[PDB]
Amino acid sequence: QVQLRESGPSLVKPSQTLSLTCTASGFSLSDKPVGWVRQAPGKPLEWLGSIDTAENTGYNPGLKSRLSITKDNSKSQVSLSLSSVTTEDSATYYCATVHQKTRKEKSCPDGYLYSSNTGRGYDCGVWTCRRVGGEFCSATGDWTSPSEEDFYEFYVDTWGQGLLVTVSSASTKGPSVFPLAPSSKSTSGGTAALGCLVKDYFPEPVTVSWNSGALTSGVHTFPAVLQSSGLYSLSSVVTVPSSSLGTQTYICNVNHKPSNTKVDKKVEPKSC
Amino acid sequence: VLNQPSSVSGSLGQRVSITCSGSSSNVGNGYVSWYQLIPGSAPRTLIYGDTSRASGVPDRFSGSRSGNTATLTISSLQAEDEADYFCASAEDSSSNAVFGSGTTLTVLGQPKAAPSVTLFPPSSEELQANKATLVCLISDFYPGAVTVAWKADSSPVKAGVETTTPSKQSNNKYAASSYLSLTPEQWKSHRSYSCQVTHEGSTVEKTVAPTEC
């Protein structure tokens, strides 16, 4: 199966050169062309560049003076470099297999078709663009010569997972995980909601699971808020049976890869 | 950038269309692609070559092109189709891709639901760290438009409030969260704090008190 995994820093200082690596799986880089696409917060998808089987590279024009893309077929990797980054370069970056193909075809205008026969079927001999319905072989308004045209084919085949890159002069900060334990008045009948508050981390993302992924019923990791301090805060909640509170232990597994941090916080019940 | 509608809406089981307008040098060249972006998942290629269905894509998705305007048509609109949709085309080169401005698709007809609101007071650990955060989680509601207000005792409080934008859960209902950041002294002074969630005219208010545990 074809997979592409992005790797690199989650945080880059302004003016530095963001460098990312794409590990390919399930195909040879000497077979499929590989390109990069990014999306900024609230912005549309933006093309970056691509490298083909013949090592020829093609970039977004507006960014060409800052982009460099290289390939290693042996290590099966594709590297992207974007220089002089700013906060506008904070985005999600994907690598992907792309289809690119130029078609040096011949073309006739609209209402004309490549033929050697009039509308009635009289054989003119020579092949050329003839007007549909026309009855003369050499009348001025009944033929024209084929014009050579290039038709470009592009699309994105299989997408990678996507790496969130944040450009900022602020430094990394690990999260602080606090419990959100349900009191006796907080329950909802046979079920209760309990969670984890992941406070003050930078940069994004943070993912939260429950009981090492074994507890999936009702799990929802909320979006993060950006506080005025520049740090993020996040909450995760899970629905558990109210009868099990005090018996079954519940632990939230917070992961913050930008700081290489993993926190397993045990949410113990409130005594009220 | 290929002009797309900013946001469109359709009904379940119905048919919806999304336009993609450009010029003679891109969409006019005759090779438009369509991609579906679901919040969380990776981008998914839906259509290539104006009309060709991508591998694994259901027949409900269709692609067409008229002149400088491509169109993605989704028939039998399902609930899992709520996503952003982008068009793309080459331009004067097979390596110079231009994408569209994107269209957010909203699926209508799903059942309405009043929000379940849970208000967590500051944990003992956080208070021991000289911090206080009131957390207000809002789950299982539709449509996805709520408004949160905070009450200190019975007066309205606005400073230190941070609220997320509603986002869909795994059960396809919307969820949101609100935070009130207080110093332990502020948490101890007033007698109670309240989170008011307004959804379709209804107002569900939860309340926590520092006198309790």
XYZ file of all heavy atoms in Angstrom, chain A residues 66-164:
776
model
N 12.506 30.533 -2.997
C 12.719 30.074 -1.633
C 12.603 28.565 -1.476
O 12.835 28.055 -0.374
C 11.726 30.756 -0.682
C 11.897 32.260 -0.559
C 10.697 32.868 0.142
N 10.341 32.119 1.341
C 9.216 32.283 2.023
N 8.300 33.161 1.646
N 9.002 31.545 3.108
N 12.263 27.837 -2.536
C 11.991 26.409 -2.458
C 13.139 25.604 -3.050
O 13.741 26.002 -4.053
C 10.693 26.059 -3.189
C 9.391 26.521 -2.537
C 8.232 26.358 -3.502
C 9.138 25.738 -1.261
N 13.431 24.469 -2.420
C 14.381 23.500 -2.949
C 13.880 22.105 -2.615
O 13.590 21.813 -1.453
C 15.785 23.716 -2.374
O 16.700 22.775 -2.908
N 13.781 21.245 -3.625
C 13.270 19.891 -3.448
C 14.289 18.908 -4.005
O 14.728 19.046 -5.152
C 11.900 19.704 -4.127
C 10.834 20.508 -3.380
C 11.521 18.231 -4.182
C 9.456 20.357 -3.951
N 14.664 17.922 -3.193
C 15.621 16.905 -3.602
C 15.052 15.522 -3.317
O 14.095 15.366 -2.554
C 16.974 17.080 -2.895
O 16.787 17.040 -1.475
C 17.606 18.407 -3.284
N 15.656 14.513 -3.941
C 15.165 13.146 -3.853
C 16.336 12.186 -3.706
O 17.411 12.403 -4.272
C 14.333 12.770 -5.089
C 13.654 11.416 -5.000
C 12.864 11.100 -6.260
C 13.773 10.953 -7.470
N 13.025 10.503 -8.678
N 16.113 11.121 -2.936
C 17.056 10.014 -2.815
C 16.276 8.727 -3.049
O 15.487 8.308 -2.193
C 17.742 10.007 -1.447
C 18.990 9.140 -1.424
O 19.010 8.097 -2.109
O 19.956 9.506 -0.723
N 16.492 8.109 -4.215
C 15.810 6.858 -4.535
C 16.282 5.726 -3.632
O 15.490 4.858 -3.248
C 16.042 6.489 -6.001
C 15.742 7.631 -6.946
O 16.590 8.490 -7.190
N 14.533 7.643 -7.494
N 17.574 5.717 -3.295
C 18.124 4.665 -2.447
C 17.474 4.681 -1.070
O 16.839 3.706 -0.653
C 19.641 4.830 -2.333
O 20.246 4.869 -3.613
N 17.619 5.792 -0.347
C 16.953 5.933 0.940
C 15.445 6.091 0.804
O 14.747 6.060 1.823
C 17.530 7.125 1.705
C 19.021 7.017 1.982
C 19.475 8.055 2.994
C 19.228 9.467 2.493
N 19.666 10.483 3.489
N 14.936 6.257 -0.420
C 13.503 6.393 -0.682
C 12.907 7.565 0.099
O 11.913 7.424 0.816
C 12.763 5.088 -0.373
O 11.385 5.194 -0.686
N 13.522 8.739 -0.049
C 13.094 9.922 0.685
C 13.055 11.131 -0.239
O 13.767 11.192 -1.245
C 14.014 10.208 1.881
C 13.880 9.208 3.018
C 14.713 9.588 4.224
O 15.756 10.229 4.096
N 14.252 9.198 5.407
N 12.201 12.093 0.110
C 12.082 13.347 -0.631
C 12.166 14.502 0.360
O 11.364 14.580 1.293
C 10.768 13.425 -1.435
C 10.771 14.648 -2.341
C 10.547 12.152 -2.244
N 13.119 15.405 0.152
C 13.363 16.505 1.076
C 12.893 17.828 0.486
O 13.127 18.112 -0.695
C 14.848 16.605 1.434
O 15.065 17.637 2.380
N 12.247 18.638 1.330
C 11.776 19.973 0.980
C 12.442 21.005 1.881
O 12.589 20.784 3.087
C 10.247 20.075 1.115
C 9.625 21.476 1.159
C 9.813 22.203 -0.164
C 8.149 21.410 1.534
N 12.837 22.136 1.294
C 13.457 23.227 2.034
C 12.834 24.545 1.602
O 12.801 24.856 0.407
C 14.975 23.262 1.808
O 15.592 22.082 2.298
N 12.346 25.310 2.577
C 11.775 26.634 2.356
C 12.541 27.632 3.211
O 12.512 27.546 4.443
C 10.283 26.659 2.700
C 9.582 28.017 2.614
C 9.510 28.487 1.171
C 8.194 27.959 3.236
N 13.217 28.574 2.563
C 14.097 29.501 3.258
C 13.336 30.729 3.750
O 12.222 31.021 3.307
C 15.242 29.939 2.345
O 14.757 30.731 1.274
N 13.964 31.445 4.684
C 13.508 32.759 5.141
C 12.042 32.730 5.566
O 11.238 33.578 5.174
C 13.745 33.814 4.060
O 15.099 33.812 3.643
N 11.696 31.735 6.385
C 10.301 31.565 6.777
C 9.848 32.731 7.652
O 10.643 33.405 8.318
C 10.084 30.222 7.493
C 10.462 29.064 6.581
C 10.874 30.176 8.793
N 8.542 32.979 7.626
C 7.883 33.955 8.481
C 6.664 33.294 9.110
O 6.386 32.113 8.880
C 7.473 35.210 7.699
O 6.542 34.851 6.671
C 8.687 35.874 7.067
N 5.925 34.066 9.909
C 4.713 33.540 10.525
C 3.661 33.156 9.493
O 2.804 32.313 9.781
C 4.133 34.557 11.506
O 3.985 35.823 10.851
C 5.050 34.717 12.710
N 3.706 33.752 8.299
C 2.794 33.359 7.230
C 3.069 31.951 6.720
O 2.219 31.381 6.030
C 2.878 34.357 6.074
C 2.130 35.653 6.324
C 0.623 35.473 6.271
O 0.132 34.848 5.306
O -0.070 35.952 7.193
N 4.231 31.384 7.038
C 4.576 30.027 6.640
C 4.133 28.982 7.656
O 4.384 27.790 7.448
C 6.086 29.922 6.403
C 6.560 30.822 5.277
O 6.089 30.647 4.134
O 7.388 31.717 5.538
N 3.492 29.397 8.748
C 2.913 28.453 9.697
C 1.718 27.769 9.048
O 0.754 28.437 8.659
C 2.487 29.178 10.971
O 3.492 30.070 11.417
N 1.770 26.445 8.929
C 0.777 25.735 8.129
C 0.923 24.236 8.364
O 1.829 23.779 9.066
C 0.932 26.072 6.644
N 0.015 23.472 7.763
C 0.139 22.024 7.674
C 0.760 21.674 6.330
O 0.317 22.172 5.289
C -1.220 21.336 7.822
O -1.838 21.750 9.046
C -1.043 19.826 7.843
N 1.784 20.826 6.357
C 2.534 20.442 5.172
C 2.322 18.960 4.895
O 2.537 18.121 5.777
C 4.026 20.738 5.353
C 4.366 22.211 5.382
C 4.076 22.989 6.494
C 4.988 22.820 4.300
C 4.387 24.335 6.526
C 5.305 24.164 4.322
C 5.002 24.917 5.437
O 5.313 26.256 5.463
N 1.902 18.646 3.672
C 1.730 17.284 3.201
C 2.693 17.018 2.052
O 2.972 17.907 1.240
C 0.301 17.030 2.693
C -0.826 17.555 3.560
C -1.286 18.860 3.430
C -1.459 16.728 4.475
C -2.328 19.332 4.212
C -2.495 17.190 5.262
C -2.929 18.491 5.125
O -3.966 18.952 5.904
N 3.194 15.790 1.985
C 3.805 15.269 0.773
C 2.877 14.220 0.176
O 2.086 13.593 0.887
C 5.189 14.669 1.037
S 5.226 13.264 2.170
N 2.965 14.043 -1.138
C 1.995 13.197 -1.817
C 2.544 12.760 -3.165
O 3.417 13.408 -3.745
C 0.659 13.924 -1.995
N 2.029 11.631 -3.645
C 2.284 11.202 -5.012
C 1.395 12.001 -5.956
O 0.187 12.121 -5.726
C 2.005 9.707 -5.171
O 0.664 9.426 -4.752
C 2.972 8.880 -4.338
N 1.986 12.546 -7.017
C 1.255 13.388 -7.953
C 1.416 12.849 -9.366
O 2.452 12.284 -9.729
C 1.711 14.863 -7.880
C 1.322 15.464 -6.543
C 3.214 14.971 -8.107
N 0.364 13.020 -10.159
C 0.376 12.713 -11.581
C 0.592 14.007 -12.354
O -0.189 14.957 -12.209
C -0.929 12.047 -12.012
C -1.062 11.888 -13.496
N -1.419 12.928 -14.328
C -0.880 10.812 -14.296
C -1.450 12.499 -15.577
N -1.129 11.218 -15.585
N 1.653 14.035 -13.158
C 1.997 15.143 -14.037
C 2.280 14.587 -15.422
O 2.967 13.570 -15.558
C 3.232 15.907 -13.539
C 3.191 16.322 -12.085
C 4.504 16.931 -11.629
O 5.582 16.488 -12.027
N 4.419 17.957 -10.793
N 1.759 15.254 -16.451
C 1.966 14.779 -17.821
C 1.667 15.885 -18.823
O 0.565 16.436 -18.832
C 1.091 13.553 -18.096
C 1.046 13.118 -19.553
C 0.335 11.782 -19.682
C -0.184 11.559 -21.091
N -0.889 10.252 -21.200
N 2.631 16.196 -19.680
C 2.422 17.140 -20.768
C 2.093 16.373 -22.042
O 2.680 15.323 -22.316
C 3.653 18.024 -20.981
O 3.954 18.717 -19.764
C 3.396 19.046 -22.077
N 1.144 16.899 -22.814
C 0.599 16.233 -23.993
C 0.770 17.178 -25.177
O 0.015 18.145 -25.313
C -0.869 15.885 -23.762
C -1.303 14.516 -24.232
C -2.586 14.110 -23.519
N -3.529 15.220 -23.428
C -4.630 15.214 -22.688
N -4.964 14.166 -21.952
N -5.415 16.288 -22.683
N 1.769 16.915 -26.021
C 2.024 17.741 -27.203
C 1.136 17.240 -28.340
O 1.548 16.469 -29.210
C 3.501 17.706 -27.577
C 4.430 18.188 -26.471
C 5.856 18.357 -26.970
C 6.745 18.966 -25.897
N 8.127 19.209 -26.395
N -0.112 17.699 -28.324
C -1.135 17.231 -29.244
C -1.330 18.218 -30.391
O -0.805 19.335 -30.394
C -2.462 17.026 -28.504
C -2.425 15.975 -27.409
C -2.720 14.584 -27.931
O -3.076 14.460 -29.122
O -2.601 13.616 -27.151
N -2.100 17.778 -31.379
C -2.626 18.639 -32.425
C -4.076 18.976 -32.107
O -4.804 18.167 -31.528
C -2.523 17.963 -33.793
C -1.128 17.987 -34.390
C -0.881 19.296 -35.120
C 0.601 19.625 -35.193
N 0.826 20.899 -35.930
N -4.497 20.179 -32.491
C -5.784 20.704 -32.071
C -6.456 21.424 -33.229
O -5.802 22.139 -33.995
C -5.617 21.660 -30.883
O -6.829 22.326 -30.583
N -7.766 21.227 -33.348
C -8.596 21.952 -34.291
C -9.508 22.919 -33.546
O -9.887 22.661 -32.399
C -9.458 21.005 -35.135
S -8.554 19.865 -36.207
N -9.878 24.038 -34.161
C -10.804 24.965 -33.503
C -12.188 24.355 -33.340
O -12.485 23.260 -33.813
C -10.833 26.172 -34.442
C -10.422 25.630 -35.767
C -9.428 24.548 -35.467
N -13.040 25.092 -32.637
C -14.397 24.631 -32.378
C -15.233 24.682 -33.651
O -15.222 25.676 -34.383
C -15.037 25.476 -31.277
C -14.359 25.280 -29.932
O -13.342 24.552 -29.885
O -14.839 25.850 -28.930
N -15.973 23.605 -33.908
C -16.687 23.446 -35.155
C -15.892 22.785 -36.258
O -16.453 22.517 -37.329
N -14.609 22.515 -36.032
C -13.737 21.859 -36.993
C -13.248 20.540 -36.411
O -13.027 20.421 -35.202
C -12.536 22.747 -37.350
C -12.874 23.937 -38.220
C -13.629 24.994 -37.727
C -12.423 24.008 -39.531
C -13.936 26.083 -38.520
C -12.723 25.093 -40.331
C -13.480 26.127 -39.821
O -13.780 27.208 -40.616
N -13.081 19.548 -37.283
C -12.612 18.233 -36.869
C -11.550 17.745 -37.842
O -11.584 18.066 -39.031
C -13.765 17.223 -36.786
C -14.810 17.490 -35.700
C -15.929 16.466 -35.766
C -14.164 17.490 -34.323
N -10.599 16.973 -37.322
C -9.508 16.452 -38.140
C -10.042 15.344 -39.037
O -10.312 14.233 -38.571
C -8.376 15.948 -37.249
C -7.117 15.571 -38.000
C -6.320 16.544 -38.590
C -6.717 14.246 -38.106
C -5.165 16.207 -39.273
C -5.562 13.898 -38.787
C -4.791 14.882 -39.368
O -3.643 14.539 -40.046
N -10.199 15.642 -40.325
C -10.776 14.695 -41.266
C -10.192 14.942 -42.648
O -9.471 15.916 -42.881
C -12.305 14.804 -41.303
O -12.849 13.962 -42.305
N -10.517 14.035 -43.567
C -10.159 14.156 -44.974
C -11.386 13.975 -45.860
O -11.276 13.552 -47.012
C -9.072 13.150 -45.345
O -9.483 11.829 -45.043
N -12.564 14.291 -45.324
C -13.827 14.127 -46.027
C -14.757 15.275 -45.672
O -14.817 15.702 -44.515
C -14.499 12.794 -45.677
C -13.735 11.598 -46.206
O -14.033 11.086 -47.285
N -12.747 11.141 -45.444
N -15.490 15.760 -46.671
C -16.460 16.822 -46.459
C -17.650 16.299 -45.654
O -17.708 15.131 -45.255
C -16.926 17.389 -47.797
O -17.639 16.378 -48.523
C -15.736 17.854 -48.623
N -18.619 17.184 -45.415
C -19.817 16.773 -44.702
C -20.614 15.727 -45.458
O -21.216 14.836 -44.856
N -20.622 15.816 -46.789
C -21.343 14.846 -47.600
C -20.600 13.524 -47.735
O -21.216 12.518 -48.104
C -21.621 15.423 -48.990
C -22.504 16.659 -48.982
C -22.850 17.100 -50.395
N -23.750 18.246 -50.405
C -24.293 18.765 -51.499
N -24.051 18.258 -52.697
N -25.098 19.817 -51.387
N -19.302 13.502 -47.447
C -18.512 12.292 -47.524
C -17.545 12.211 -48.686
O -16.972 11.140 -48.914
N -17.346 13.299 -49.427
C -16.424 13.285 -50.554
C -14.983 13.273 -50.057
O -14.590 14.108 -49.236
C -16.672 14.497 -51.452
C -15.726 14.607 -52.627
C -15.870 13.788 -53.740
C -14.697 15.539 -52.629
C -15.008 13.889 -54.818
C -13.832 15.648 -53.701
C -13.992 14.821 -54.793
O -13.131 14.929 -55.862
N -14.199 12.322 -50.557
C -12.817 12.170 -50.121
C -11.961 13.290 -50.702
O -11.792 13.385 -51.923
C -12.278 10.805 -50.546
C -10.992 10.427 -49.827
O -10.289 11.331 -49.332
O -10.684 9.218 -49.760
N -11.416 14.134 -49.825
C -10.535 15.212 -50.249
C -9.086 14.773 -50.397
O -8.316 15.450 -51.089
C -10.603 16.377 -49.258
S -12.258 17.042 -48.991
N -8.697 13.668 -49.768
C -7.329 13.199 -49.852
C -6.476 13.616 -48.672
O -5.958 12.767 -47.941
N -6.329 14.921 -48.470
C -5.461 15.439 -47.419
C -6.220 15.484 -46.100
O -7.412 15.813 -46.055
C -4.916 16.826 -47.805
C -4.030 16.719 -49.035
C -6.054 17.800 -48.056
N -5.526 15.140 -45.017
C -6.077 15.237 -43.672
C -5.838 16.637 -43.124
O -4.710 17.141 -43.162
C -5.439 14.201 -42.747
C -5.752 12.784 -43.096
C -5.100 11.998 -44.001
C -6.790 11.974 -42.534
N -5.673 10.750 -44.042
C -6.712 10.709 -43.151
C -7.779 12.196 -41.572
C -7.587 9.670 -42.836
C -8.646 11.166 -41.261
C -8.545 9.918 -41.891
N -6.894 17.258 -42.609
C -6.777 18.597 -42.045
C -8.027 18.884 -41.223
O -8.981 18.104 -41.216
C -6.585 19.659 -43.134
O -6.255 20.914 -42.525
C -7.856 19.818 -43.967
N -8.004 20.013 -40.518
C -9.177 20.450 -39.770
C -10.220 20.966 -40.752
O -10.009 21.988 -41.413
C -8.803 21.529 -38.758
S -7.564 21.055 -37.524
N -11.337 20.256 -40.863
C -12.415 20.611 -41.771
C -13.640 21.024 -40.970
O -13.936 20.435 -39.925
C -12.751 19.438 -42.697
C -11.522 18.861 -43.377
C -11.868 17.953 -44.543
N -10.703 17.732 -45.389
C -10.276 18.587 -46.309
N -10.907 19.727 -46.538
N -9.186 18.294 -47.011
N -14.338 22.047 -41.457
C -15.521 22.543 -40.768
C -16.635 21.505 -40.823
O -16.903 20.920 -41.877
C -15.984 23.858 -41.393
C -17.223 24.462 -40.747
C -17.566 25.809 -41.370
N -17.942 25.699 -42.775
C -19.189 25.574 -43.210
N -20.213 25.536 -42.372
N -19.415 25.485 -44.518
N -17.277 21.267 -39.676
C -18.371 20.307 -39.619
C -19.528 20.805 -40.470
O -19.989 21.944 -40.321
C -18.802 20.072 -38.164
C -20.059 19.216 -38.112
C -17.672 19.418 -37.379
N -20.001 19.951 -41.377
C -21.076 20.290 -42.278
C -20.635 20.858 -43.611
O -21.410 20.813 -44.573
N -19.416 21.390 -43.696
C -18.900 21.944 -44.934
C -18.932 20.962 -46.086
O -18.821 19.749 -45.881
N -19.085 21.473 -47.307
C -19.243 20.630 -48.480
C -18.122 20.768 -49.500
O -18.076 19.974 -50.447
C -20.586 20.925 -49.167
C -21.791 20.693 -48.268
C -23.092 21.144 -48.902
O -23.041 21.818 -49.953
O -24.166 20.826 -48.349
N -17.225 21.735 -49.341
C -16.112 21.927 -50.257
C -14.812 21.477 -49.603
O -14.630 21.603 -48.388
C -15.998 23.391 -50.691
C -17.250 23.938 -51.316
C -18.048 24.838 -50.629
C -17.625 23.559 -52.594
C -19.199 25.346 -51.203
C -18.774 24.063 -53.174
C -19.561 24.958 -52.477
N -13.903 20.948 -50.426
C -12.643 20.428 -49.909
C -11.621 21.524 -49.643
O -10.831 21.409 -48.700
C -12.051 19.404 -50.879
S -12.808 17.768 -50.807
N -11.611 22.585 -50.453
C -10.579 23.609 -50.346
C -11.138 25.020 -50.208
O -10.370 25.983 -50.314
C -9.637 23.546 -51.553
O -8.958 22.303 -51.605
N -12.442 25.176 -49.982
C -12.995 26.502 -49.750
C -12.375 27.120 -48.503
O -12.038 26.425 -47.541
C -14.516 26.437 -49.608
N -12.222 28.447 -48.531
C -11.532 29.141 -47.448
C -12.228 28.922 -46.110
O -11.572 28.672 -45.092
C -11.440 30.634 -47.761
O -10.773 30.817 -49.015
C -10.670 31.365 -46.673
N -13.554 29.004 -46.092
C -14.288 28.868 -44.851
C -14.655 27.442 -44.490
O -15.563 27.220 -43.683
N -13.954 26.463 -45.071
C -14.241 25.058 -44.814
C -13.047 24.262 -44.303
O -13.175 23.046 -44.119
C -14.788 24.377 -46.081
C -16.253 24.692 -46.329
O -16.830 25.495 -45.566
O -16.830 24.135 -47.284
N -11.901 24.896 -44.065
C -10.753 24.165 -43.547
C -9.784 25.134 -42.891
O -9.792 26.337 -43.165
C -10.044 23.367 -44.649
C -9.181 24.210 -45.538
C -9.574 24.893 -46.651
C -7.778 24.462 -45.387
N -8.505 25.556 -47.202
C -7.390 25.308 -46.445
C -6.812 24.055 -44.461
C -6.079 25.754 -46.603
C -5.509 24.502 -44.620
C -5.155 25.341 -45.683
N -8.954 24.584 -42.009
C -7.853 25.312 -41.396
C -6.799 24.297 -40.980
O -7.065 23.095 -40.912
C -8.310 26.148 -40.196
O -7.200 26.896 -39.684
C -8.860 25.252 -39.099
N -5.591 24.796 -40.703
C -4.578 23.797 -40.400
C -4.581 23.453 -38.913
O -4.954 24.282 -38.077
C -3.196 24.302 -40.806
O -2.439 23.274 -41.419
N -4.178 22.233 -38.560
C -4.104 21.866 -37.140
C -3.038 22.674 -36.417
O -1.906 22.805 -36.889
C -3.755 20.372 -37.175
C -4.142 19.913 -38.542
C -3.899 21.085 -39.440
N -3.410 23.218 -35.262
C -2.505 24.006 -34.438
C -1.930 23.120 -33.340
O -2.668 22.379 -32.684
C -3.229 25.210 -33.832
O -2.339 26.036 -33.101
N -0.617 23.186 -33.150
C 0.032 22.370 -32.134
C -0.194 22.985 -30.759
O 0.093 24.168 -30.546
C 1.525 22.244 -32.433
C 2.212 21.099 -31.713
C 3.596 20.821 -32.263
O 3.905 21.316 -33.368
O 4.376 20.111 -31.593
N -0.719 22.188 -29.827
C -1.051 22.677 -28.496
C -0.565 21.699 -27.437
O -0.579 20.481 -27.635
C -2.562 22.893 -28.326
C -3.112 24.124 -29.028
C -4.528 24.450 -28.593
O -5.098 23.673 -27.799
O -5.070 25.483 -29.040
N -0.158 22.249 -26.298
C 0.250 21.461 -25.144
C -0.888 21.413 -24.133
O -1.402 22.456 -23.717
C 1.509 22.043 -24.499
C 2.732 21.902 -25.382
O 2.803 20.917 -26.145
O 3.622 22.775 -25.313
N -1.279 20.202 -23.751
C -2.322 19.968 -22.760
C -1.674 19.397 -21.506
O -0.999 18.365 -21.569
C -3.385 19.016 -23.306
C -4.153 19.573 -24.469
C -4.289 18.846 -25.641
C -4.730 20.829 -24.394
C -4.994 19.360 -26.712
C -5.437 21.347 -25.460
C -5.569 20.612 -26.621
N -1.871 20.067 -20.377
C -1.212 19.695 -19.133
C -2.171 18.910 -18.247
O -3.313 19.330 -18.032
C -0.700 20.938 -18.404
C 0.158 21.830 -19.276
C -0.329 23.037 -19.762
C 1.454 21.463 -19.617
C 0.450 23.852 -20.561
C 2.241 22.273 -20.415
C 1.734 23.467 -20.883
O 2.510 24.280 -21.677
N -1.703 17.772 -17.739
C -2.455 16.922 -16.831
C -1.779 16.942 -15.470
O -0.585 16.636 -15.364
C -2.527 15.482 -17.343
C -2.973 15.322 -18.780
C -3.146 13.864 -19.156
O -3.072 13.010 -18.246
O -3.353 13.569 -20.351
N -2.543 17.292 -14.440
C -2.054 17.293 -13.072
C -3.151 16.804 -12.146
O -4.317 17.170 -12.310
C -1.606 18.691 -12.621
C -1.312 18.784 -11.146
C -0.042 18.522 -10.669
C -2.307 19.126 -10.236
C 0.238 18.598 -9.320
C -2.034 19.195 -8.883
C -0.758 18.935 -8.426
N -2.767 15.983 -11.172
C -3.601 15.781 -9.991
C -2.756 15.172 -8.882
O -1.600 14.799 -9.087
C -4.841 14.923 -10.283
C -4.592 13.483 -10.675
C -4.510 12.483 -9.714
C -4.488 13.118 -12.010
C -4.302 11.165 -10.072
C -4.286 11.805 -12.377
C -4.189 10.832 -11.404
O -3.983 9.521 -11.765
N -3.350 15.092 -7.695
C -2.697 14.550 -6.510
C -3.303 13.183 -6.226
O -4.508 13.071 -5.976
C -2.852 15.483 -5.300
C -1.956 15.021 -4.166
C -2.541 16.919 -5.686
N -2.470 12.144 -6.262
C -2.953 10.783 -6.067
C -3.195 10.494 -4.590
O -4.289 10.747 -4.074
C -1.960 9.779 -6.656
C -2.556 8.395 -6.823
O -3.713 8.184 -6.403
O -1.865 7.516 -7.383
N -2.186 9.963 -3.906
C -2.297 9.586 -2.503
C -1.650 10.655 -1.633
O -0.492 11.023 -1.854
C -1.634 8.232 -2.245
O -2.180 7.252 -3.136
C -1.870 7.790 -0.807
N -2.395 11.141 -0.645
C -1.912 12.176 0.256
C -1.232 11.564 1.473
O -1.587 10.472 1.927
C -3.061 13.073 0.719
C -3.689 13.888 -0.366
C -4.579 13.457 -1.305
C -3.491 15.285 -0.611
N -4.941 14.497 -2.126
C -4.288 15.631 -1.719
C -2.715 16.277 -0.002
C -4.330 16.925 -2.234
C -2.759 17.561 -0.514
C -3.560 17.874 -1.619
N -0.252 12.285 2.004
C 0.361 11.911 3.257
C -0.546 12.251 4.427
O -1.689 12.684 4.276
N -0.008 12.049 5.630
C -0.793 12.313 6.831
C -0.866 13.804 7.138
O -1.934 14.316 7.491
C -0.211 11.549 8.022
C 0.004 10.062 7.770
C -1.287 9.312 7.483
O -2.380 9.779 7.806
N -1.162 8.139 6.872
N 0.253 14.513 7.010
C 0.276 15.936 7.277
C 0.974 16.298 8.569
O 0.624 15.789 9.638
N 1.963 17.182 8.482
C 2.725 17.633 9.638
C 2.429 19.104 9.892
O 2.541 19.928 8.979
C 4.225 17.429 9.416
C 5.146 17.729 10.600
C 5.388 16.479 11.437
C 6.456 18.325 10.121
N 2.050 19.430 11.123
C 1.760 20.807 11.503
C 3.057 21.511 11.884
O 3.714 21.126 12.858
C 0.766 20.847 12.663
C 0.536 22.223 13.295
C 0.068 23.225 12.251
C -0.460 22.134 14.439
